[PDB]
Amino acid sequence: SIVFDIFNYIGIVAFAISGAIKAVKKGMDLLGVLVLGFSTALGGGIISNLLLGKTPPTNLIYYPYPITAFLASLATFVFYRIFTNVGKPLLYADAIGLGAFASSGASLAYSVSNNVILVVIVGAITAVGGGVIRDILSNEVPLILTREFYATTAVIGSFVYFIASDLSVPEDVALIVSFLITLILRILAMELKWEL
Amino acid sequence: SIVFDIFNYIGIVAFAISGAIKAVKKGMDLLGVLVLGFSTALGGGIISNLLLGKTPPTNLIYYPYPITAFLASLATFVFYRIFTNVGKPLLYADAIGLGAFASSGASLAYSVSNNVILVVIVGAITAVGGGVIRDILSNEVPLILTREFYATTAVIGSFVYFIASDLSVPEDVALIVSFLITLILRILAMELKWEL
Amino acid sequence: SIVFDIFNYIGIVAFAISGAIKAVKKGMDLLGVLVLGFSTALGGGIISNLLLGKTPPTNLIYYPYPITAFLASLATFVFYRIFTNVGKPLLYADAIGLGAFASSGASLAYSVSNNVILVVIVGAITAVGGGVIRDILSNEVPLILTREFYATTAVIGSFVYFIASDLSVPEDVALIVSFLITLILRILAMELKWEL
Numbered sequence: 001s002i003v004f005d006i007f008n009y010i011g012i013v014a015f016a017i018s019g020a021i022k023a024v025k026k027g028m029d030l031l032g033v034l035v036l037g038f039s040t041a042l043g044g045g046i047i048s049n050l051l052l053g054k055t056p057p058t059n060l061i062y063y064p065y066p067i068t069a070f071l072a073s074l075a076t077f078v079f080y081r082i083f084t085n086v087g088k089p090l091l092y093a094d095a096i097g098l099g100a101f102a103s104s105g106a107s108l109a110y111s112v113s114n115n116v117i118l119v120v121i122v123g124a125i126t127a128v129g130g131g132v133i134r135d136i137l138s139n140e141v142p143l144i145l146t147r148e149f150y151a152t153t154a155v156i157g158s159f160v161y162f163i164a165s166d167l168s169v170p171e172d173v174a175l176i177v178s179f180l181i182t183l184i185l186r187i188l189a190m191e192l193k194w195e196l
Numbered sequence: 197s198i199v200f201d202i203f204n205y206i207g208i209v210a211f212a213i214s215g216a217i218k219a220v221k222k223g224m225d226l227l228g229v230l231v232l233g234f235s236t237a238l239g240g241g242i243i244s245n246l247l248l249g250k251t252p253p254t255n256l257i258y259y260p261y262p263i264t265a266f267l268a269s270l271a272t273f274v275f276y277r278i279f280t281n282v283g284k285p286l287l288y289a290d291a292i293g294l295g296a297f298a299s300s301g302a303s304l305a306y307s308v309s310n311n312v313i314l315v316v317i318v319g320a321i322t323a324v325g326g327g328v329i330r331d332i333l334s335n336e337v338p339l340i341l342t343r344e345f346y347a348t349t350a351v352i353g354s355f356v357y358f359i360a361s362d363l364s365v366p367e368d369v370a371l372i373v374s375f376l377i378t379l380i381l382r383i384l385a386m387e388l389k390w391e392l
Numbered sequence: 393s394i395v396f397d398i399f400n401y402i403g404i405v406a407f408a409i410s411g412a413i414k415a416v417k418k419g420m421d422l423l424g425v426l427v428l429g430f431s432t433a434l435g436g437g438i439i440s441n442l443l444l445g446k447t448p449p450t451n452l453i454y455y456p457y458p459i460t461a462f463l464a465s466l467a468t469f470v471f472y473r474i475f476t477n478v479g480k481p482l483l484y485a486d487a488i489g490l491g492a493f494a495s496s497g498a499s500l501a502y503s504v505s506n507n508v509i510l511v512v513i514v515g516a517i518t519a520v521g522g523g524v525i526r527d528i529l530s531n532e533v534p535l536i537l538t539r540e541f542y543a544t545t546a547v548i549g550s551f552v553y554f555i556a557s558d559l560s561v562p563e564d565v566a567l568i569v570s571f572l573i574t575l576i577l578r579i580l581a582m583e584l585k586w587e588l
């Protein structure tokens with residue numbers, strides 16, 4: 001479906017931006033920024049692929065995905081190399097990626113089996129997995145532990161995808177509703193200071 | 197066998213307690229405590245499943261296992277939310293899990309192949325793997341490095357399972373002897389201050 | 393081919409030395425030193441095997457590989473237990489391993505598929521993966537982030553293996569040229585202070 005394909009690109013771009021921003025804040029230079037953005041963008045899909053027995057992983061064979069990760073990370077580096085003082089919305093980029101991958105990752109797991117536990121947990125791991133790798137490599141406690149509603153919101157997003165698909169909702173709509181609920185939940189938590 | 201099934205539940209409960217305790221000590225709140233307990237309880241089995249080519253992992257498809265991880269972590273949070281000053285035996289919970297999973301993890305590897313190296317190493321990775329993930333997420337040097345006899349004791353436990361099975365020992369007995377040797381070795385190291 | 397087999401042993405020895413050195417510097421004792429050397433030596437091959445769908449991993453079934461990792465780590469511990477003040481060339485050992493595994497890891501991926509992205513990225517992950525695990529376990533930002541030209545040099549080494557193989561270069565020669573370019577690139581970066 002077109003929405004599934006689009007969400008893959010949105011998630012790759014968003015997580016690449018979040019990883020490249022993290023590296024910029026850490027003081028890394030161009031190539032180190034590319035490494036962290038590339039890893040954050042593709043890590044969730046790779047981990048998800050391994051859990052589902054899909055080898056080699058799509059992110060390592062389908063050329064547009066790693067090319068998109070590379071270009072997004074490079075664009076982020078160049079942007080903040082010029083505009084050093086403008087805001088760096090790491091959590092906003094991460095949140096958009098969380099919604100794109102909780103939905104598309106739940107979709108991939110649901111195609112493997114109708115098991116609600118597999119769909120909800122693999123979907124959530126797809127969503128958070130790139131940011132977990134980013135935080136581990138950065139040598140800091142990850143968001144899934146420091147942000148009280150973060151991992152659960154990914155779980156909720158993959159669960160609403162499962163429920164929608166279970167009710168025969170068309171795949172394009174089930175993905176959009178899952179993405180929107182995940183993103184909205186994150187915006188409320190961030191804007192209403194639920195995690196403080 | 198009944199002992200294999202029982203050891204799976206014992207290991208899941210024990211490692212969930214150890215992960216939830218770690219999160220409580222870190223100052224996390226309810227949902228963060230659940231995340232760390234869930235991850236510690238199921239991580240070793242997932243890693244073991246991937247190494248042996250078993251996908252999707254049993255911990256993500258067999259409902260009682262993640263349900264047990266969730267309930268054990270929730271019980272731990274509620275207990276220490278009320279009884280804030282009572283002792284938190286993280287290492288004791290981890291040690292019981294180490295014995296339950298070194299034995300059952302060696303059993304799973306032995307069913308795949310009679311290779312002593314595969315059985316001993318995959319068994320040890322099953323045993324320590326959940327606590328390694330816990331310590332990495334907590335952003336601290338893991339027990340497998342800070343505790344001089346920890347990883348080796350898991351190796352010894354999986355090796356005694358291999359030897360017992362190689363001698364035709366019934367599976368229920370081979371699991372019990374492996375579990376007991378692992379746990380006893382850990383109790384001696386902790387009580388006799390071997391790791392100081 | 394003979395060069396592929398030799399490079400496996402060179403990489404295992406080199407990364408075992410680098411991991412055992414890291415543990416010695418961290419103040420670990422004998423068994424902890426063995427754990428970190430063993431993990432660094434075998435982690436890249438295990439990760440590479442999982443990405444390519446090769447289970448159980450060769451490093452866990454082919455006896456000479458983990459035996460070599462163990463003996464190399466033990467030799468490193470004994471050496472620095474006696475000669476406490478002599479230099480500890482962690483980065484030099486890591487660099488030799490990087491060249492041995494970028495080449496041999498690219499070779500393994502190329503046997504699975506002619507996809508330049510798969511060959512270059514899996515090759516680079518094979519090369520850096522053991523040192524990434526070492527640095528994560530040591531609880532420090534890994535070399536792939538702190539050393540500006542490190543990860544890219546592994547990528548270049550696996551890419552020159554791909555180009556050589558694509559041009560019909562004999563496998564023994566393609567491995568040697570890949571190894572030499574990776575190692576030389578690392579020597580220049582270290583000696584010419586490119587990463588400062």
Ligand SMILES: [Mg+2]
Pocket residue numbers: 136139140332335336528531532
């Ligand atoms: Mg860390």
